[model samples]
Target: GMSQVQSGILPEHCRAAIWIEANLKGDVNALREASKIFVDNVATFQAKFPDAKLGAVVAFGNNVWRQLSGGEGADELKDFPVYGKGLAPSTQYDLLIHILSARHEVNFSVAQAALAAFGDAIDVKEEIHGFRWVEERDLSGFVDGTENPAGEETRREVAVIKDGVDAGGSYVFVQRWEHNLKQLNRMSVPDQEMMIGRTKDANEEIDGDERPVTSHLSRVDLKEDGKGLKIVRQSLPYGTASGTHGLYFCAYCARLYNIEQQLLSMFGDTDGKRDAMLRFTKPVTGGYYFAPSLERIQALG
Candidate 1:
């Protein structure tokens, strides 16, 4: 039902985003084998699993050797470094194996199996646990990705790389955020509303004039050439009930700049502008990678 023309990142409640780095033991030839391992199994990951969706991305890193095509000098296809200033330091990774499924256990099982197959090719840096926060809401009780591009054409425009050498692929950015639920719960309901710039119950945006400049919604969007820049995001909340709650943030774009501009805005790169929600949440990891086209993926091995 899915093709490389559309990213394998379908809508699903259960997700497993496995972040990998080249093992210290190898990167010279081992990673070339590692890259082939990913491409060789593209269909395998998506095949016959319960409501499964799969995609892979390679960051431009020393370990990646010859990175996947495209993203050269593309306006927003820049490196994603650490962002935010706070306690938990920001983290980044080299390769990301993204898996999604509607069946609760499917993704986790398949992802681990993949790592097993890879064997000593990579170091397992992180094993993310993704669950639906609440009816497509983040753990903070606010709607997430409400304005995401919809419809066949719009979603394709937002997620698929329609042209160029990496045509039919997706440029992806992945980040791990640690959400402070205790501190957030300590705040009054209205204070939380102002912070996110939306009514928690209705998930409606406060009007521009009435919204604070520091609101999460206000400071995070950008319009390029008279149009709202967009990305197809698959963001999921993860963590234990008591401690270590966070979001596994992943966005797929036809143009990498769409995601980059939002990041700059979130970090307030120019005018000390950053999201108001930064105080209640923080980034723990981040990196950018290119999800090669299925055709390209298959050809690698």
Candidate 2:
């Protein structure tokens, strides 16, 4: 029922955007050199493909915050930096295409190149995990995406753990949703809201009864987090088929288990209750990863 658009590119032109994870060979030491390699490569890639758009760069881990600029303790990595230079910017498609074209541009392979850039931008020592496209896996066999969570407050709630061994680490969920525009358009807007449980204007919640128990957002939203636990959702639109399109859903949180627990409650085998919206969409890929801290860059060399 949700309004949808078809993919603008072709399947052949679209490649599975792979998510990568790795532990720094050394700790902070290896990160330093890695940062240099990452930044230099990014500059080169950007120069080659000035049209490509860069997406959001997020970091988590003990010293991850240190990798970011214009914040307290940021001076810790003055010489070796990681975070992207500006606020979240849309990576030009052409830029991404150009960057992906370079072969053996650095000592690392394609997979390693992605890992190195991710490592240098954040100061963590190891990658928790990573994700990319695959196939739809909602209970209904259609596509699905970011169920729901606390908005705006998502960053603080999901990325910063308050206690324990995983204190510095954060949980991340990445998924791709392919939309069936024709199927979605067949339904009326009111019918669409029934499936999404939100209004069209701001996509905000409407009457509680409007959303079905099987709707995507209804199934996974964290309704009662006294502590206000939330997750940040950063998604991008991608696809090649004229009638097939979808979003790259990415979430960040402080506790991996807690987040997974929430998702399990919605679509896990035992709890599986297919979302109504899934009938018109499909998840093509998924993965998990830990964002590192900027300080790790010092260890790369």
Q: Number of the top candidate by TM-score?
A: 1
Per-candidate local distance difference test: 0.65, 0.41
Off by over 4 Å in 2: 1-36, 39-154, 161-169, 201-204, 224-229, 241-243, 268-270
Give the 10-residue window scoring lowest on summed lDDT in candidate 1.
62-71
- Cα lDDT tens digits for candidate 1, 162-271: 66666776777777788888889999988899888889998888877787878877766667677888888877888897878878887888877778678777777646
Q: What is the lDDT of residue 184 in candidate 1?
A: 91
Candidate 1: where is the Cα deviation over 4 Å? Answer: 1-3, 10-25, 32-42, 50-78, 84-90
Question: Candidate 1: which pairs clash?
Answer: 76-257, 91-284, 91-285, 268-273
TM-score of 2: 0.52
Q: Per-residue lDDT tens digits of candidate 2, residues 11-86?
A: 1111223333233333434444544565456556556644433221223232433432214432211111111221
- Cα lDDT over the full model 2: 0.41
Candidate 1, residue 294: lDDT: 60
